Design a binder for this molecule. Structure first.
Ligand SMILES: CN(c1ccccc1C(=O)Nc1ccc(S(=O)(=O)N2CCN(c3cccc(C(F)(F)F)c3)CC2)cc1)S(C)(=O)=O
Ligand SMILES: [Mn+2]
Ligand SMILES: [Mn+2]
Length: 230
């Protein structure tokens, strides 16, 4: 079975999520064929050099999973788009592109964070357009940690998540010719039915973690959205 999670928003002052993720890693993920983390693993990311002890501990925990024989893959979310190759090495994760098609037990499944589907949110898409320019990322990362942190305090006070655009959903699923899509971002967990490629299709939406978690579990038999206790 292949597992998908997203929208953990890990944060020092949300210890229930930290504990729940550590358990998931030790119990569920160790038994999987593969683990995919579809963005917003962290509440915020200002660079791989951040000395936050949470990052040390979470990297070692994820790396224990891939070091055990279970590959771990990451797609960036809007919160953690700066997570880079240094932290990918620390955590034993492979970084994926924005959109990726998997072939799982016969079935072709598109995965993404989901923010690129929220095409009606003008402010968000403008924000996203700038902060994804490599040259600008390199300048922000060159700033001192304490400056990066003050900037990030503003930007989060300043920032209710707009839901996906249906034309964007269908366009992505027809571009990749898939009948299955898994994403997060919107924090509205559900299995939706729709039409893509003039056939039945499914859009499976992960939930954010707070007092419990969610995963999608993919087997040859089934695609299941599972909501599970800490
Ligand atoms: C859907 N979200 C939004 C909606 C509208 C507008 C923005 C967002 C959004 O994701 N905001 C948001 C995302 C991440 C963060 S952060 O992790 O604290 N941090 C903030 C500092 N960032 C940064 C700022 C300028 C240039 C560059 C650079 F590029 F130079 F590195 C990077 C790096 C990321 C802070 C704010 S929401 C409601 O969750 O906040
Ligand atoms: Mn999220
Ligand atoms: Mn998001």
């Amino acid at each position: 079975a292949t597992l998908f999670i997203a929208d953990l928003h890990l944060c020092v002052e949300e210890p229930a999520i930290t504990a729940g993720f550590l358990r998931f890693l030790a119990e569920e993920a160790r038994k999987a064929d593969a683990l995919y983390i579809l963005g917003d693993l962290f509440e915020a990311w200002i660079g791989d050099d951040d000395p936050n002890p949470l990052h040390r501990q979470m990297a070692a925990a994820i790396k224990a999973v891939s070091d055990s024989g279970v590959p771990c893959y990451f797609i960036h979310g809007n919160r953690d788009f700066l997570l880079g190759k240094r932290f990918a090495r620390e955590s034993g994760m492979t970084l994926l592109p924005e959109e990726k098609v998997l072939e799982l037990y016969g079935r072709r499944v598109l995965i993404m964070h989901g923010d690129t589907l929220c095409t009606d949110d003008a402010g968000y898409q403008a924000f996203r357009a700038k902060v994804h320019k490599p040259w600008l990322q390199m300048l922000f990362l060159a700033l001192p940690l304490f400056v990066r942190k003050r900037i990030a305090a503003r930007m989060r006070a300043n920032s209710a998540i707009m839901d996906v655009n249906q034309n964007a959903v269908v366009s992505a699923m027809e571009k990749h010719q898939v009948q299955w899509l898994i994403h997060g971002h919107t924090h509205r967990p559900a299995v939706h039915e729709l039409i893509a490629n003039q056939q039945p299709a499914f859009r499976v939406v992960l939930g954010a973690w707070h007092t419990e978690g969610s995963m999608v579990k993919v087997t040859a038999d089934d695609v299941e959205l599972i909501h599970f206790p800490f």
